[PDB]
Ligand binder design. Structure first.
Ligand SMILES: *[C@@H]1O[C@H](CO)[C@@H](O[C@@H]2O[C@H](CO)[C@@H](O)[C@H](O)[C@H]2NC(C)=O)[C@H](O)[C@H]1NC(C)=O
Ligand SMILES: *[C@@H]1O[C@H](CO)[C@@H](O[C@@H]2O[C@H](CO)[C@@H](O)[C@H](O)[C@H]2NC(C)=O)[C@H](O)[C@H]1NC(C)=O
Ligand SMILES: *[C@@H]1O[C@H](CO)[C@@H](O[C@@H]2O[C@H](CO)[C@@H](O)[C@H](O)[C@H]2NC(C)=O)[C@H](O)[C@H]1NC(C)=O
Ligand SMILES: *[C@@H]1O[C@H](CO)[C@@H](O[C@@H]2O[C@H](CO)[C@@H](O)[C@H](O)[C@H]2NC(C)=O)[C@H](O)[C@H]1NC(C)=O
Ligand SMILES: *[C@@H]1O[C@H](CO)[C@@H](O[C@@H]2O[C@H](CO)[C@@H](O)[C@H](O)[C@H]2NC(C)=O)[C@H](O)[C@H]1NC(C)=O
Lengths: 19, 49, 19
């Protein structure tokens, strides 16, 4: 992809499945 | 081929799958047609008759 | 359904929530 940007893609499950 | 032959090369597709496409086209989930396949086919046949 | 086929439907959560 031309124009792609570095950023975080949050995940709703990860903090939850830890609990 | 459904509607594909109008846009380019005709790509074959089983007719019930094409009817499921078209059921999607009007806002009804395709499971409705797959569950009422026989009833729908009979209704179409009687309508043609 | 006429034409239904037996196959596996993978689940992304199951291996993860085990961790
Ligand atoms: C969009 O175009 C601009 C130029 O108008 C690009 O900016 C240049 O980027 C190159 C390297 O990518 C630099 O060497 C130039 O000095 C930049 N020009 C200026 C004056 O900023 C920009 O990177 C392009 N971005 C996209 C998304 O295509
Ligand atoms: C996004 O981050 C990656 C790293 O995860 C960058 O890739 C690096 O690019 C720098 C500079 O070109 C190199 O010094 C590193 O060795 C690279 N690392 C890897 C792992 O590729 C990438 O350039 C970043 N992109 C943007 C647009 O910031
Ligand atoms: C939905 O309506 C259709 C009407 O086409 C029903 O199909 C008929 O059902 C009656 C009773 O079983 C039969 O006597 C008719 O011969 C059927 N018509 C055809 C063309 O098959 C269908 O049963 C109804 N289904 C629901 C969920 O009520
Ligand atoms: C599509 O139609 C073909 C027939 O052309 C079906 O193949 C037959 O399957 C039955 C299973 O009950 C066999 O007894 C026949 O011998 C098969 N015919 C041949 C020559 O292969 C096929 O099962 C049908 N599939 C679907 C999705 O409807
Ligand atoms: C998909 O798998 C099920 C089993 O989970 C099959 O159902 C079996 O069918 C065989 C042969 O008709 C019987 O001997 C078994 O007793 C059935 N078991 C159950 C639990 O129903 C089914 O036939 C398979 N379908 C396809 C298309 O392979």
């Amino acid at each position: 992809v031309i124009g792609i940007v570095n950023n975080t893609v949050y995940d709703p499950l990860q903090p939850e499945l830890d609990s | 081929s459904g509607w594909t032959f109008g846009a380019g090369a005709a790509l074959q597709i089983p007719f019930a799958m094409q009817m499921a496409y078209r059921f999607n086209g009007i806002g009804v989930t395709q499971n409705v047609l797959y569950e009422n396949q026989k009833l729908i086919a009979n209704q179409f046949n009687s309508a043609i008759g």
